[PDB]
Design a protein around this ligand. Structure first.
Ligand SMILES: N[C@@H](CCCC[B-](O)(O)O)C(=O)O
Ligand SMILES: N[C@@H](CCCC[B-](O)(O)O)C(=O)O
Ligand SMILES: N[C@@H](CCCC[B-](O)(O)O)C(=O)O
Ligand SMILES: [Mn+2]
Ligand SMILES: [Mn+2]
Ligand SMILES: [Mn+2]
Ligand SMILES: [Mn+2]
Ligand SMILES: [Mn+2]
Ligand SMILES: [Mn+2]
Ligand code: NA
Ligand code: NA
Ligand code: NA
Lengths: 318, 318, 318
């Protein structure tokens, strides 16, 4: 009913931004966990736009060392179109991933409708390698480079990405959670003057101050739509173990909920990505459920579920 | 010897405030863990008033959906009498639970002797459902409603509770740890203007600031006796798993000790409840010991055990 | 190449400061974990001075209740000589322990070259029992007493320690992590006015403020060399389980990295001890690797590995 609780879900069952099979099941496991029902229970208007059908691209040889470029490019192109449709329908886009390369499409599509958007990127990694700085060639570690205006002339013409137009400036993104940043990525971060809170900053300041500073930075001048791109590897693997690039020393479950509670309360959440859940990578069934349950919790916080409690505007004592 | 270390232990082996058998063994396991000996080792004057004999009440059909009302009411009536006796003996009452419905008796009895008492309630839950807002009917989720003066006309005449006189005002209680609050409960919390620190606040402020604010709020105007009612479910289930209503994202072991260290240092601790330890609910024997050991640690902190260390007033270098 | 990254490694495979066999394997497991290679990868100039050969001292009966005094005294004497050699070579000494009694030699040797050094002691314990206050007789719980000038006349003539000259004053050491302090030790701490941050302080202030205060205290007046003596039991046993005197409620992995990141950034790290890793005490092989991996991580942070990332002074986009 409220704008902050009016939602369009998009499943993006896609894995070719990285090597490990299984992340394409993220949308299924999150749905099976009752995500849609649980959103409706907390007074959300929820429309399911379904799972995007990503067509196989059998002929997709590497571009230099960059892997599956055409598949990744097309999946993001399709996703951009669907996100823009959801935004034009007046809904918060909720993308269930799928690997993080999809943020190229998610943010691109969002920005077509709301070009003034600000991005909060919750991740152990900066995901800001270019096709030339990457050493893995995995496109889930490169999405931010494709989106950044300052980097336009450093991105080669990669097959599958001719549709991309960089849509955010270095000032329009804040990182939270960083703890495994490649040297080239660190160079870009410092060269461009991008705002970040690595785990060192979170330890120094506390998540309270991190969020105050994050939101003041993005929203101080003027209010604008927020895009939250949440890689579950941002949280410590003790919370989200079933993911492809875990890094110890992460955000706690509490910190994850704080981040998302605070974002919800701005009333400005406009796009959300819940990325990199890979149920095939749980060592045990409990590791899977633990990961999926945490992802659902984070998502519910984004749409108003508060640890202090919630109530409808009625007299409960009558 | 010191007033803050002069203690009267009361076992309250009672479970009928909630469904799960086993919480009636809390006093046994805590005693078996060496709680009394360990208190004596840290220079406490400890008198054991024994385990209260709660008589079976075979005829105890629900009041509307409220379960075991007469059993719960009588157990709390008996406990109130025993707590008041301990307080008149000049001792800090230490109630070993048993389920949290017993706080009706513990706080009531305490307040008979010290009507100016302030309550700190450490819990994942507010325990403030009335007999009419509850959906579970479990009385361990309702004790605060029976104690609050503002709610007198919203509590029906429940069999077993005719002896109850509400003894605290909304201003005399502070919650710490909240993370699973029912809608009706949240309505009451906001309507009455009760001070609380949900996990969101603890994340925002840090436990340091939470305790400073808690104690300033309760003790700023004037010093008065403190009643600490500690539900072990306030701590994350990674610390206290053997409990009936666990909720993830809880207070850490460190935060639990900080809370209780700070309360100890006021010199004003006057009543303590250590509630909801249920050894039957440990998945493994280690989960039981982990839970019991944490409860003992928390309790020892309440009576002066400090992480920085403790020493007698003698020259240790001579 | 940088002074803060120019290192001399000393293995100290020694266990007789305490009862448990296995801590003498610390240097082996840390080396086997790739510590030296990993230091070189982050642009350190690393010289390996090898493992010290500690000769068996078969005739070493207790001094009162103090155990293996001659063995412990000689091992520290040898280590002092080697540390001083490394310091005269212009390198940061990196002592791989081995039990914490070795800090007598490590700090002594360091202070021969840099008498103005300041010590940061990361530990669950104060390790400041004298031969007369100790109740265990284990010399790993006494090193600080031998080093402190204020305690000279309280240390008896223990066989093996006639070479020791106390080299630090009470003002030159800061403790971080304390949570199991003996009464005599607490007496010494308060009598001498030693700066400490027990876990209570870390909880109160946050590790951010703890480090700011620690470094301001030691370096405010004037810059001087820092000696970090890091007992892995300072970290919670969930992180470093394979150690002889674990105590729950410890520093987190994140807090450990924060401490060492901040120390690195002063440019003043001059001596480092990584102590009490005992692979024989892991309940499982994973507990061993977890402990060793954490120790390596802590060590790499000391020599410039930063969670925000690191890069060489080149243009990565060219
Ligand atoms: N920086 C590494 C890791 C990328 C991790 C990607 B992510 O955050 O989306 O899981 C790479 O370029 O391959
Ligand atoms: N609010 C729920 C849960 C109560 C939990 C009670 B407690 O905190 O004492 O374990 C109920 O009314 O049943
Ligand atoms: N205070 C105890 C414990 C000493 C622990 C030593 B350590 O910190 O180096 O492991 C003793 O004197 O034996
Ligand atoms: Mn990512
Ligand atoms: Mn990542
Ligand atoms: Mn309770
Ligand atoms: Mn509770
Ligand atoms: Mn030590
Ligand atoms: Mn120690
Ligand atoms: Na990831
Ligand atoms: Na409970
Ligand atoms: Na140790």
């Amino acid at each position: 009913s409220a704008k902050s609780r009016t939602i369009g879900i998009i499943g993006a069952p896609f894995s070719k931004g990285q090597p490990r099979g299984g992340v394409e099941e993220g949308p299924t496991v999150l749905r099976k966990a009752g995500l849609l029902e649980k959103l409706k229970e907390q007074e959300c208007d929820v429309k399911d736009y379904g799972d995007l059908p990503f067509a196989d691209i059998p002929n997709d040889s590497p571009f230099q060392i960059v892997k599956n470029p055409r598949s990744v490019g097309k999946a993001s192109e399709q996703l951009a179109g669907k996100v823009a449709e959801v935004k034009k329908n007046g809904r918060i886009s909720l993308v269930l991933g799928g690997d993080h390369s999809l943020a190229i499409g998610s943010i691109s599509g969002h920005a077509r409708v709301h070009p003034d958007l600000g991005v909060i990127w919750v991740d152990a990694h900066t995901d800001i390698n270019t096709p030339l700085t990457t050493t893995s060639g995995n496109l889930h570690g490169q999405p931010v480079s494709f989106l950044l205006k300052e980097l336009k002339g450093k991105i080669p013409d990669v097959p599958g990405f001719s549709w991309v137009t960089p849509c955010i400036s270095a000032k329009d993104i804040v990182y939270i959670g960083l703890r495994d940043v490649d040297p080239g990525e660190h160079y870009i971060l410092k060269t461009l003057g991008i705002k970040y809170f690595s785990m060192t900053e979170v330890d120094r300041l506390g998540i309270g101050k991190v969020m105050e500073e994050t939101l003041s930075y993005l929203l101080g001048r003027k209010k604008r739509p927020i895009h939250l791109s949440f890689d579950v590897d941002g949280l410590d693997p003790s919370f989200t173990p079933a993911t492809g690039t875990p890094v110890v020393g992460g955000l706690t479950y509490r910190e994850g909920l704080y981040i998302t509670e605070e974002i919800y309360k701005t009333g400005l959440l406009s796009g959300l990505d819940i990325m990199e859940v890979n149920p095939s990578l749980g060592k045990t069934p409990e590791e899977v459920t633990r990961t999926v349950n945490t992802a659902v919790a984070i998502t519910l916080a984004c749409f108003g579920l508060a640890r202090e409690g919630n109530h409808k505007p009625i007299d409960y004592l009558n």
